[PDB]
Amino acid sequence: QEGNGPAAVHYQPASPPRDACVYSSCYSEENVWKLCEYIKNHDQYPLEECYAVFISNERKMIPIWKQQARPGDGPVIWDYHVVLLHVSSGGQSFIYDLDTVLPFPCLFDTYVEDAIKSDDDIHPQFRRKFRVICADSYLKNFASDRSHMKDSSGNWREPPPPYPCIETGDSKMNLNDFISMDPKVGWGAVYTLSEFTHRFGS
Amino acid sequence: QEGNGPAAVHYQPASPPRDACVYSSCYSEENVWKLCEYIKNHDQYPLEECYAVFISNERKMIPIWKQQARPGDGPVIWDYHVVLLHVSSGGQSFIYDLDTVLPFPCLFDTYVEDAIKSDDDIHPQFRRKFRVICADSYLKNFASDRSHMKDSSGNWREPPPPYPCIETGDSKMNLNDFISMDPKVGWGAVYTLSEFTHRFGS
How far apart are CA A29 and CA A43, in angstroms? Predict the structure, then answer.
């Protein structure tokens, strides 16, 4: 028998701690994009091991439990919500959600169970779908002019993030193409809750 | 009526107290063999209720927390480690580890939870595997010439136990066959951490 030298044996998060991440309430698509930017700019993990994940449905009403906005367990009904998925080297997958009360990051199995619960127990208009976009692709292609966050009067529904709107060489606004769950549109692949769970679950 | 709560269920230990057990640091395989020999030579419990348990992995680096060699400070990373498992007629199972800072013996659910933790977020190279050998079989078959404990110059890595090497009619050395977590090799059965915990846990 011999005791080896000390070593870090646990998964190391790809992000900064939850309280050190760039964040604006109601701009999860951006918060997630910012995590992608951080990962890209660091050498800990390849960017391609990560995915931006949009959650929505045709009716744009998805319940998510264990959300910060509503502490104590009823759900928040969102039009869409975005989280980050890290498909880690050992078959262990993690979810980074800046709006969850669950750990940041959180093991995938735990997150999907606690946050989402079962689609079977809710009516069809509320069922959850997921667009999974590889992080490199997301940085390359995502663009939002934040126009959706201004009311009829031109005032901000929620204050915007402190940096200029994300744009690309090809577009200044394509957020709807990410929110959409039609496989004929946008980038990445679309999965039902069951499919998503099976695909990235343990 | 008598009610307790798992940690409070009554149990009489199969060994002498920790301070009276034969023990050499870095020779857990031998320390456990000696415990098996003691049990055999006593009439308290049938030997067949007990198992020698080897803990290792392919890379031979396994973390174990609550270890004497590293008080309060993370895990010890062992090439391999050996403990005794008593499957009690009392319905609760116990772990005897001469190297733990937990009680000796310790209720199984508690030992695994504190000492082992989960492999859910542990790097692949560090995941724990268990070889469980019924105690009668261990005494019948185990042999070690202690050759692994001599360095390249022929000197001891750690001082040996002060009794002659354990040998059998069939071998002078088969320690590698116990350390191995290959089911094709050796005696007993091999389990993942999850399997081991589900099997012997509550």
Answer: 23
